[model samples]
Target: HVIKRDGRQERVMFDKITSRIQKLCYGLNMDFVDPAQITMKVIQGLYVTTVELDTLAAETAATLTTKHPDYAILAARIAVSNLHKETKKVFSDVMEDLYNYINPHNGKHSPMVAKSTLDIVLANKDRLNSAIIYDRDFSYNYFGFKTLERSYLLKINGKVAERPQHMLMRVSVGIHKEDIDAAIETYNLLSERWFTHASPTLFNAGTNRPQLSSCFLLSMKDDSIEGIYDTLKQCALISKSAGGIGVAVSCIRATGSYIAGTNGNSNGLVPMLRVYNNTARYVDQGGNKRPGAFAIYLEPWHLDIFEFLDLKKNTGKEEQRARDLFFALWIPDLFMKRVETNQDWSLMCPNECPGLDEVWGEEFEKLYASYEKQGRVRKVVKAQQLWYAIIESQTETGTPYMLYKDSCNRKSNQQNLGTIKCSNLCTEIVEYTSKDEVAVCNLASLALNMYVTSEHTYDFKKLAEVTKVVVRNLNKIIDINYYPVPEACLSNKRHRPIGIGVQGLADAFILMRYPFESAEAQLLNKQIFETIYYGALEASCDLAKEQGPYETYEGSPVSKGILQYDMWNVTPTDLWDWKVLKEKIAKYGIRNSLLIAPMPTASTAQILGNNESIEPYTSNIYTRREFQIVNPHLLKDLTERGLWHEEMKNQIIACNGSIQSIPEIPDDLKQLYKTVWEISQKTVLKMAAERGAFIDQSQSLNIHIAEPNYGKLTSMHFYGWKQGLKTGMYYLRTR
Candidate 1:
């Protein structure tokens, strides 16, 4: 006899083990993979007892997944089944366990769940239990399920106390509160893998501090000592609540500028930003889930531009560098023109050149030239020289992300509020932020691959339906969310902005048999975004009919019947009736100020097992925390064709994660699985520009160059600038 996890033992039955393994081998390639082989491994590692036998078997299957993708499915099944064995079947039982958890060290009750959430769960236990479909847990891939188990699923005294379904229900309930129907609706949508909230929402949703927003944008309160320290405190507070921050420092006076109170010189942005950098390192997000990230935004015309560019470099002086913080440029069109025409660019002190950062477009041009005329310039240098320094810094460090100031403000519907100061840390969120108002964004992303049918057709109607649901949920979040600061709360309630992004655009294209750079793919991309924007607008209009428009909606461009596409002077396809949407908006206005920002889905994409937000695969084969994972779809097709082996893996490795040169791979598959490096950056930019018409805010657009050089970087920047992208690039990722 042997002992199991529950201390129940039975005679060693290899037949039972083999039968269980065979049951999970339904869709896997039988000829290439043997269930008996996995059963042998599981039993070989069975020690003296059957403790965690299912875990051993699941590991065996997972290790073989590189040989065939179907093994990934089987591995997920075994793992999920093992989890199910250890956990309760009813959702309410898990909730009760979590709510009644006690601290073993103290021997006293210390509930992991909050009282209000627990009460709601106890009250609706029966309905919640029937609503969950446990079988859907098996739908996750091995890596995705493991990611959930590792970080996402709720725990009781360091043991996983909730299953994936239970965690989704908790998040839904947390967001919807007493609204059971909406919670179930959200639960079903999330369970089906159609969409997901951002990482913070997933992490803190049902907890005592339900700070569910992902990004916060702020402007420096003032240029004085009081203002600087106060802004630092805000950054620390927001970071503690698991929010990423972007702060604009354009109004701060330059180095050596006069400080009236102290009768001394200002330290400029470097020393001040160093203090921010230290705060970021010290006060990590939600107790060390991630380091606090603050992306400092400065315009190019600042006197400290050269020092700012070198802050993240490897060889910079310690005093001059703040390596922990990210840097981005709030670029104006005038600088690009100077770099293009090789004209002299003037740097100025904000004290002397007051109001320069407060304007945009032609007004900005007039103000800048007037400052230059008045000799308020602190220094003058060749624009190309400054541009080259930017390239040099990017070569060493991947940042200062680039955002076009004029384009961002020109296309903004919030232009009426004020000039949009800066974007969020990721650069996707462009909202109006003042010293009194800290901008916030509630984010969710659709898994684009879900809309790709088995028949290889794209489903725009389903995409629209899902977008509407996402919009409604995000709107509800603004009301229910626990705001970290009073300013953030006020800004959120007034503007009511939400970001609707997408993951797996590349996967969706592959599913539909469309090459990423193909005309069909481009057209599909345009139509999908058009549908999302239309659906979101339609939904917002519906809400407006019931609740009236957002508070600041009356004087905005949208209130005057100007949509994002209208601002861009671009036309949409007939996929949705834009005319009808416009008519409805004119009648009732819209509830949200802005919508449809495709943020970079960093962690959420992993949960859904998809490519990151609208990006081509960086590589078909890449390392994920030391594990070299081959794209599962690529592995599946290769295994099905009997072309997968050690040599094939070696070939892919030798090609530097590219398959185009590998002769054994079919041409169609090569085209389908081409990495981002293999695709043209122009195609990526073109797609971003095409999608820009529908995105009211902005995108975290990253530009990749295998070997970045001065000339190449300049050309890429100029091209994107000419194309009129709001964010020219997020990070200059180089090989």
Candidate 2:
């Protein structure tokens, strides 16, 4: 017997299923995706709950999505429509119910929404309630919607209790708090897909522990047991609040180093990192949202660098491995110079080397050379041997991200603050950290394709406008954020850094008919960042005019009239008035110490239906975890040209997500749809350089290779380093 919506058990009517499927198939291409087919599949199942039946219908439709992208759309509609029926519709009602929830086991009130948020929503009941348009919930694609259902949507009594639109409003209100108009504006922008805050912001925004910042960079407290435990506890607390961390362990003493207090030899980073790995597994981010992410950063000069490179390898000894922790190298120019000239590398313990971790640039180079001359080195090896080990590890594990220390420090507007140690988890955030101060950067990414006009132009003004709003939002978050430890709070308000990245650059290029490697696309790449930097600076200066600038802004580059571009010695285009910004900044002083960090937008981009941050489409079609997604842009172009059929789809799929091997595809498409694999790393590095001028911090730059060798990777690494990119590589992605 089938359970009706009103919960009456009755015999199933197959026609009702077919009719329901037909009703939801509006605007889908009927030729490719037949509602009758989905109905036939539904009939194979016995009587089930109405909710189960709807999901079965969607699953059937989703299975046929390989036939056409429209089937994916229909599946999304069915699932979103199902969610709309299952959850409460009224925004205020959901907030009230969630805020008023009582735990079932323990008869005590356990509010999901924070009191401040509930009060704000209650005060603006009529306006906030009426402002929400329920139809926006249908905007998610099938895979995107499922990602939301599984993780994002709020729950009550173990059932999904909030709709997508309601969550968006809650997050908006969560960010803006009592600024009702600002909240509404951000809601419209988020709903319409202009930009999205990072994943932490989306998950915990309106919750009790509103830790909205995305990236946290920490310097190791000291080599002592007490100092190590203190930092580890700090990591556990921050990870519990959904923060991705990068901790510089360069200050830790290497193996066999003397602990003067105990007069015992140190065990090195491997054992300590293993404990961290277990902690990462134990305390997941934000109530088990995902595994804890902690990227450990150490300089190549450390004595245990060789062992550190092997921790993530698949063939490593299990006890010695810490695969759960991510790894990166905070490389200095002296090391790269030594490698280039084929000189010797002297690995030393921080206990012996003393101050190498505390300085950068010429100071570091001279100090390091002095150590070598003094024979304080623990070991010596050919520099090329160490370089080969890095490549070999990447070939196996796709890790130990390469970040340039000199470039990150030299180009930073926070240069006067101190020598920046490491980047955050994504290798995008570059900020100064100390034993007492843990750097935190709040983040957001603009949807670049949203600004692409139908007439093949970019709306720089609108892009800039959105950037200004984002800057204000990020700055506001700095004040209202719940710091996991006192140190994060101390560093954040002082430096006030923000990362503004962009997604769908490849989508924008496709919309403009500009190939990823084309000169025009490269110029647009440069211009886009210029506009964002200009917009971020102008908006920050305006904020300073009101709030009198961030603390410790005095010795900063912006305070001294040196912008990011000036540090790189590159000139920007005529898109914005840089001189006016410089003059205004000199007068009012910018509020943020650092801005314009391009992050790897892995989660938020999927939710917003955009390509990852400034990345080319990975493929025309590929299976990603749960869904076999087809590139919507390529599918649309093929459909319009009457080339989208099962055979064509099969052809692209058989080529392993590359369209270049398919002859039926048009020349423009063949060039436009080339996956990252088919593109040249030379072009990728050059484009990274073009945008590097305006990117004040750095980018989460991932390099891809199907199969790699030492020679090929050596050249690739050298190319980016020679170009002076801050983050030489985030991940050496290989297949």
Candidate 3:
């Protein structure tokens, strides 16, 4: 006899458990897999009923996943089946329970969902409930299922009150409210694992404070005491609403600069950033859901840049360091040119050199040189000296991201707005921010693996279709989002920017049997982004026909009939009609100002069980929590070949996750499992440049070097600069 969750005692039958496990093994291998073995191991856990025993059985089956990938699928089936038994089948019932939930401790009704969401669900309960395909919930692996259970699924009274299908349907309905047809379409696509929105959108879409945008770019309000405190307050408000921020402090004066109002010497950016670091620590996003992240951006020519680079270092002075904040360099082309020629560079105070931050390209170069001649220079140092300091800081702390100033502004569609200051937190967004307007971008990433066919061919048509859906969804999000400040609202409504990114490009390449560094993979990468950009442009044009173009659409590069590709002086393949897209944009215009920014989908990719955005596999085997897990696709392929065993696992571990040296593995398998470290960095930069023509905004392009030295770092930066990359590097990872 065992105790149940409902306090009833019952005998757990071994045969009954065995039969249940056998049913789930329908498509799996019966010759190698033994359900009886799992049942026996589960029955040994004493003092448990059928419910607890099923969980134990699922976990036991998951432990054998390294032996066979089918065991992992069986594990997900058992966990999903248990969840179905414990929760309501109908989506409406779960929403009702969540909406009218009562706190057990206080005995008070505390609704977990918003009233508007409940009203919509209740008004169309039958159709919405019947629309969900419960079978799709079992498609997740054990790891993805548990991730959903832990954080994604809606809960009532400390228990999971909704299933994975229910959560997907709820998110769809929440985004496309009152449009049941669109809601169903979104639900089907999301349930099929086509793509997913950013984390905040998924978490708070149906609840109050529906802040959906992921990245926000802010400019310092003014160069005064009042402005500093005012901007600090704005950061707190946005962070409270769960927006990651990137702010430019280029206009702020340097250390020991004159202060007219105070009649005293001014402290520089370090102290001000320390206060921001404290605020970031104090105000965790949305009540500790995630930490408040602020990436501080400065130009390399600022006088206090050396101190700014030291802020995130380990051995910095206590008062000078602000390790809680992220740092990035808004690098100028002139700086790179100077470093290449070994020339001297001048630094100036914004107060004395008033127009330095307000210009770019030729105008910027002329103005900077004029200041150098005018004796406004606070210090003059060898350009390579600052360059080496940047390299050293990156080697120590892994950051202070590198974004080319001239390339970002030169090719920007928003160049006419003003000198675009800084990228967003992830360094993908490069929108213009002003003293009055704070730029904002809502993001979603397509799962590239979803577009792979069983015949090992890529599906460009379906990729285009899904990108259109994502475009419409992100556009809708901009209208429905809750803006924390008036400036952000003004910017979003006026510009209507949206970021459409992709995850699992490497997985898609693997499924199609293309090596990461192969020419076929490069062509696919270029064509995939081309299709997304074409599709998004068409969709935004359709939206413009319905609701007119965005308010600031006039005078933009796209408004003048020049697309992103044209700016890069690159032509598209015959996959899409560029002439037609250009003509369409010329007539009706586009709804959004910017589109197709490939962001780092760090958190959302985990929920969907895909690799992070557009990156190659870091390793075939890596640690997740305490478990040393193999890549599921790699494991499945190896198992099907009868090549996976304890010996192979140990061999991979000993080789530092590289399989090229493993003699037992075939050359084809070794090629397929080549980690990022094994691939050439030149090829990586070439791919980035190839896809960059279609990306109107930039990408969070991180550069990896096993052992970074001065010459290696210099060569990489100059190579990317010559290739015309906006974001040269996001982080420099050195082993």
Candidate 4:
């Protein structure tokens, strides 16, 4: 019986509701979760609740979920059960319902799924639902499920219109509707969580307005008012559909440059950047999805570089700061060399030294030297002073990632496009961003600890299988992605670049109970990446066997049979069968142009609450709050007092967010929880370099300097640079 809005009494159908939830329990552990009990709880909230039944069921079930994590699973199951009840089961039926959907706002019918995607699904309606494993709905973690529930899973108005299986099939068919087998394969990988599609892909994969990718990389079209504002419009439109951006502003002329159009000198990057900064803060992604994030990249030679560094600082003048925007330095090798020699360095305005931002390496050096000879420098400063200024800004604020311009350009296959100017905010991408083409990439991070076996061993074979899954998922994301602009879609499909990162190196070490700085940990660190790189490469090679190599793969390092290690002339540690993998690569070309960039997990890691991507914990006693450290002896005292719950609390607290500091904690726990400050910095550097051979893309390497000074930072940078690191000290972390 249906309850009416006019306070009319109706009989409740308990069995009907129970049966709906029961249908979704096909693969879940349902012994503990009785659907009857859930229905009992859900009934209490309904008459008083103005929301729809599915919404009410989701709320009640989520509240009950605190009893067990599986309750959360059952909560999702109940919601899925309801959705499966309401939604069309066959793919063709869902498409028909979508195509005929009338917008209540305008009363005009517009299909939610694209005409292209709808055509293929309607053509093969009989086989599509068979391929969907509705049972896989049970596999999502409560949090991951809630993430989908709250926002991810598509809905109509307030009604859930797509089942989990429906969403997956829609995304797969949207990307590979032309190829039936590929669509099924993509759906399987996605269902298994070997990897996930990006946020945008999840939002609009099969929609009428299919805006499907997560990231967009752009170069300022031009520096003039019309050009800059025109580019700003493009950014706004992209953000309106939920896209993250990495943009290059290296070509924008510096302060005091002659402007022929206006007959006025340029106000430089600072004033112009403030405009972008406000746009990011104001026009948030897809109407409150996430704050719009714009990472602005600049070369260090720009005259206003000092002001650029100060943009993200904590205690800076409001007029001089653009804190909403992330900043990065595109450092040329010449800058590091000059600093090493303790020489004077010149800063050039782009208006004066025209091509400096346009080139890299010897060509850059030659052009820069000619500009200096021609007396075109805007300002000159002691190299040490600029270096010290960078350190100072870093000490005050944790950002303005120092990316190596020459190394990024020199090592990238996209170098053929032009000099690669910038990296994403997380410091991973190194594609060519130019006036005509925006360098775009799709990214995903593998949970490295998941590969560790129950017996406390790393499973190389499983790593290989999962890596292929990640590779294929990312490749599929490229095709189905809704490009904010035609340029992004064009660049992404042709270059076919993907960023594969990792999380939980520290977790893996802890799970194995190895001291973070131990030789075993170091060896495992290197071997883990070696396995990932090999696995990703082998999977890409398999992709090549079927679909062919990336369009720009020819004449590149990997195509020429030169590995990332070969670029540095380093030998592997003989953990895996490198010779065997090498032979396989030589036989079948690899699909991707780059692999293995360890990005800082600022968001996802927080959702998982693991340490940020392959990085050491910054503290042993941080509150995980702002500027507060728990008293060190708080836990041990409670443990010795024989207060059991207090002891647990203290154990959790002294697990200080790490367990090594708690004496009552087991030796295994102690070994597992050593903080970054406790671990030797030398060990961190060694492990980074050890894993460096396998990373075609660079790690966002951070140096935690307790008492950062010229001597310590100099020693650290030199150690990494001498160790043949392509990206030396991506940033410096200080307390």
Candidate 5:
């Protein structure tokens, strides 16, 4: 007997399954795919939840997508449709059900939504309820809905309890609190697929623990045992609430350095890093995310730098390696010139060479030179020799993420605050961190492809409109956020950082019929960041008009009328009057410290069915568990021309997601859909520099090399450094 959505039990029939499958197959090819095939397998169920019936059908259809791209679309729609059927449609009632949940074990109430949020929702139930359009929940594609179901949606009794629309509304109310208009505005924008918050916000918004900030940067409290262990507990606490960490060990004394109290020697960074890796592995971000993500940043001057470089290498001894924790180099540009001139590179202990991490630019160079001449050096190696070791590690292990310290400090608005030690786990976030302050950034991203009009023209007006809403929303997130440590709270209120980024740069180019490397695509890319920055600064000044700017705003570059472009020495395009905005900011001030930061957007972009942030398409045909995912844009264009079939699918799969060699595809399509491997590294760096003029905080720049060569890696990083990027490369993504 087939159990219906309600309590009724009816006998399962083959026609019944096929009829339901036929209802969702309207846009798909009927001649090739047979709905009876799906029905033939699933009709054998007994006492099954109707939810399982639809899930089985969706999985069955998904596994057959290799034959036709339309099947994936049908699969996505079926999954979303299945979810919408199971969950409540009204936004407020879903929150109430979550709020009034009971613990089965102890018979006590265990609520998910915050009580204050529930009260606000109940008070404005009518406006919030009618404002949400339930049909918008169907807009998400298959893998996207699966991503939502697996993580984003709140579950009850281990069953999915919230629709996509309901989750967006809850996030909206979570940010704006009692402000219904802004909440509804954010809800509509999210449901309409305009933008999305970071994963931490999406996971905990309006929930019992509203820890919405994404990245946390920590500075070692001191060089003592008390200092190191305190920071460890802080790292554990932050990871417990879903924060990816980047902590600087630049100030810690090196191995064999004498301890003042016990008179014993230090053990160095590898053992400490292993403890952190285990901490990250143990704390699982509360709900099945990556083992609490942590990145350890160290300066090359540390005496144990060689061991630090090999920590992630595959051939390294297990006891000596900390493979789980990511490693990054906090390098100064003087090191670049030293390698350029083949000068001697001196390594020193920070305890002996105090304050190297405390200064930047001329101050750093002077201190290092003084330390070298004053006999503080532990060992000296040829600069090029050290450079070779660095590249060799990159060749073997794709890591030790590289970032230039002087460039990061010289370009930062927070430079007046202190030397910015290190960026967060993703390397996009560069902020000031100190012993008493743990830097925090709340983040959101705009969907650039959404603003492309049907006439193939980019709409600056609506793009700016969306940017302002995102700025306001991220601003609100700061006050309402639950900080795990008092230090994070102090830094957040004082600095008030909000990260703004974009997804679908490649999609925007494709929509406008321009190749990824074309001049027009490059221009559009620069202009898009320009628009987001201008709108963000413009919105920030308006907030400052009322709140009187953020704390410590007086000493920032924006205060001196030297904007991000001025720091880069680039002239602005006349798209918006930068002169006007600068003067306006001069009078009213800008509310936030650092305005625009482009994150990696790995998870949020997938959930919204867009490509990763500010990047070209990695492949034309990515994989599914049991099927191959044909790139949606390519699938549409091919299906329109009747060119997509098993022969074409096999060609794409065999060629490793590149369609350039396929003779059946035309020149324009091949050029428009070129993968990142075919695109030049010079062009990738060019685009990063172009958009970087208006970017205040750095971008998560990644270099894709099919195979690593020493010459290629060295030149790529040097050219990126010459371009003055704060983050040279996040990861050396190699095949």
Candidate 6:
């Protein structure tokens, strides 16, 4: 085909596009996805012009992807082909181009990949280019490639400057710049989609401003003016570097305790938290992309506990509200027992009870009781009163995550370091944080859905192999990641903790046609975590053989032949040889202290286009609003199948967030996409407890109910406590 350009006939190679698509079909089943037939569709869709042909051909190919996941691969291939035709393939050339990237602001040359990395690549130009495999770029799904194109792949002054392969190569060099072989290995692992770097790493890994860690945990250095602001600044800096934070302010005194320095009654947590709320809004992730999320953790004994729970509610006073900041209750077990028996709950100021935040387990219980006996309580209320308030807040706002204080402290290997005060924003990384050391953990979530086979069986062995690779990769990240603060480096190097999490357990279940609350779903959930725990353990063991156990591995629970399940007094199902593995762990020790932390992949899961963690579908139909544009997808298959009408979508939107109540929907499909509100809180808590053994670190367990009351929440918390979950609920959500 020829098009008039610059007053001349410019011939377009339509065969070139067809041949490229054909080449990508080498191993795919062509019987169902014929390249020639697909090419004909492409030609029919295309206009005579080359640019129009490119756009139409790509769209046509992408539309075929829903037939098979492989067609998704082919779509990505043709798109990559179009991109390759327009870009340079050599590493050095790309580096040279990126290095010359000029930010118009002040004509500043801002190279996306690090200077050190660029130097290494240029140093081994021949080897780096030769090592590249262009075909690997086609392995990405159509949707995945669209995501990379949309935001992930590196850009030059707002233009997408790097191809998918280029970005992978760049990240590889960034992580292992000094070792060419290691760089290629990381590149292959990433391009193969076996695993992926965390969001922050993918965004800035090879870049000059590489703050690669996903979550940071901090303890408010002190309650004083100097200490509080200093900690706030640290949070801001980390958030700017793309790190979410979990902060414990349990050291601060309750609302009405006397302040000796000011000779006045304390203003309490709400006033101080307002300042934090402002900071959270002000300190955006990267720059103006995502807002900073701070999950504030408070012990239940605080006098201001009532005000703390109300912080995220819609009707709260402006001065008391920090709704933008997420909230959680770091509850002690004694409190749960107190609530269970309907005992009096005493609220004490931390200033009065000085060591409550510093101790856990029996020490905490004993001290708390002593304070109660001494009548140091600022107020005496029925434990269930506070429980009702928590429920009320949850019904109004979906926040104040619940983390069992005793369980986190009891099961932690980092317990030897100090009383670990808080979990990260996602509640995945539960490490000890103090004034001098702000804990940091780099994360990588395994694509568990990828391991599901057509035969409806999970490949636990493959899961184990991938876990080892991911473990090795995360370890390398700890060594090579760009630390945002000196304290982050200190904590990371000493602990070397890495969080291995999963996405799409719910999806895997649905694909297997298992109901969300069925026995099969429960068993699958248990086995998934069991396999993850086992694989993560074996990988850490291998790493220990090479680099020795993590610095604080001695005196930990695992060292005593007490795996997480052992701590919970739960028995394994013999899917993996827990007894034998425990014996091996006892002998050689494990490298990492906390291995399986199932985090809420809220943002990352959207990128991979899956549900968050192991949670059920929040709704059958939901609106996706970006900027001012809205895209809606119904939970029912007709809509997911692209057969839905606008009127039906609006009906869903009008139903609020509930889908099961819609009479038009069939019973079977309704069962499949039951929102968290539709399901029982008992079932939700039961599932958490069932999977607790595999989670060495706590999970961001959120309980959702349409309208929560004291009876429901009290029973829910106690149920998880009785069931022996480390983290009972990360947050309680109510209508």
Error of 3 at 491 (Å): 0.5
Candidate 4 regions with alpha-carbon error over 4 angstroms: 1-96, 122-126, 131-135, 222-230, 260-263, 286-291, 314-318, 362-375, 476-480, 511-517, 542-550, 573-591, 598-646, 654-656, 675-685, 700-735
Alpha-carbon deviation at 154 in model 6, angstroms: 0.6
Please report how far candidate 1 places residue 436 from its true position, in Å: 0.8
Q: What is the C-alpha lDDT profile of model 3 across 1-735, one tens digit per residue?
A: 777667877677778778888887867876557887787788776756657777888888887776766787788899998888789978898898887777877888877887799799989898898888998887877777887787888877567988988888878877988998898999999988999988878877787668778798999999997999999999999888778999999999999899998788789988899889999988996455446999999998999988988998888579989988999999889999999999998988898898687888888999999988888899999999999999889889888999988889988888779898899998999999998899999999999999998888989999999999999999999998889999999999999999999999899989988889888899999999999999999999999988999998999888888889889999899998888778878889999999889999887787788888988999888655344468878887877787777678888888788889878789987888799988888789989999999999999988889988888888998999899999999988778
Please list the Cα RMSD from the true structure of every candidate, rounded to 1 decimal place: 1.7, 2.1, 1.6, 5.9, 2.3, 4.7
Summed backbone clashes in each candidate are: 0, 0, 0, 3, 1, 10
Task: Report the lDDT of model 1 for residue 446.
Answer: 92
User: What does the lDDT come to for candidate 3?
Assistant: 0.87
1-735 per-residue lDDT for model 6 (tens digits): 546423465665556657767777776755445666576786554346554566566667666543444665676676777777766878788977888778888778766567777788888889888878888776665666777787877677555778877887887777776878767877776776656767877777777867788889999989787898898888888877767889999998777788888899878898898888888888886457556888899988888998888888777568977878888888888887787789989988889888899998889888988998888778889988887787677666756667788888887867778898878887767899988898888777877667777888878788887887777777878888877788988888877888888776677777767768988888988888888888888888888878887887887777777888887778889788877887777778877777777787765666565667878777654333221111212322554454455456566667765666667776776676666777777887788878877788877777776766667766787887777777777766656
Per-residue accuracy of model 2 over 244-268 as CA lDDT, tens digit each? 8999999899999997887789999
lDDT per residue (tens digit) for residues 1-735 in model 4: 556334684566788667867765565544445778778977765453212676677656655442334555566666555555566666567666777788788777767778888788878887787787777776654445555656666666677677667877887887776888878887776665544555566667777766765667788888778889878987887777677777889888888899897788988899998898889878885456445888888888889888888888867689899988887777888888999999988999887788787898889999998888999898999988888877677767766777778777766656666777777655666677666677666666766666677888988787777777777767776766667777777777677877778776686776665777887888888788878888788878888888887787777877677887777567777766768877877877877777667766554553333456887656544433122332223233333454325235445454435555445665654665567766777678777877877787777777777677767766776676656565666567676
Q: Estimate TM-scores for all models.
A: 0.97, 0.96, 0.97, 0.80, 0.95, 0.86
Q: How close is candidate 6 to the true structure, as a TM-score?
A: 0.86
Q: Kindly list the per-residue Cα lDDT of model 1 for residues 511-589, writing each as its tens digit.
A: 8888788888999999889989998998999989988899999989898889999898898886788887899898999
What overall lDDT goes with each candidate model?
Answer: 0.87, 0.87, 0.87, 0.71, 0.86, 0.76
lDDT-best of 5 and 6 = 5
Model 5: what TM-score? 0.95
Q: Which regions of candidate 6 are displaced past 4 Å?
A: 1-80, 123-143, 285-290, 618-681, 706-714, 731-735
Model 1, C-alpha of 293: deviation from truth (Å)? 0.6
Off by over 4 Å in 2: 1-3, 7-34, 44-49, 285-291, 624-626
Model 6 residue 172 CA deviation in Å: 2.5
Candidate 1 regions off by >4 Å?
A: 26-33, 104-109, 286-290
- The regions of model 5 sitting more than 4 angstroms off are 1-50, 64-70, 286-289
Candidate 4, residue 195: Cα displacement in angstroms equals 2.1
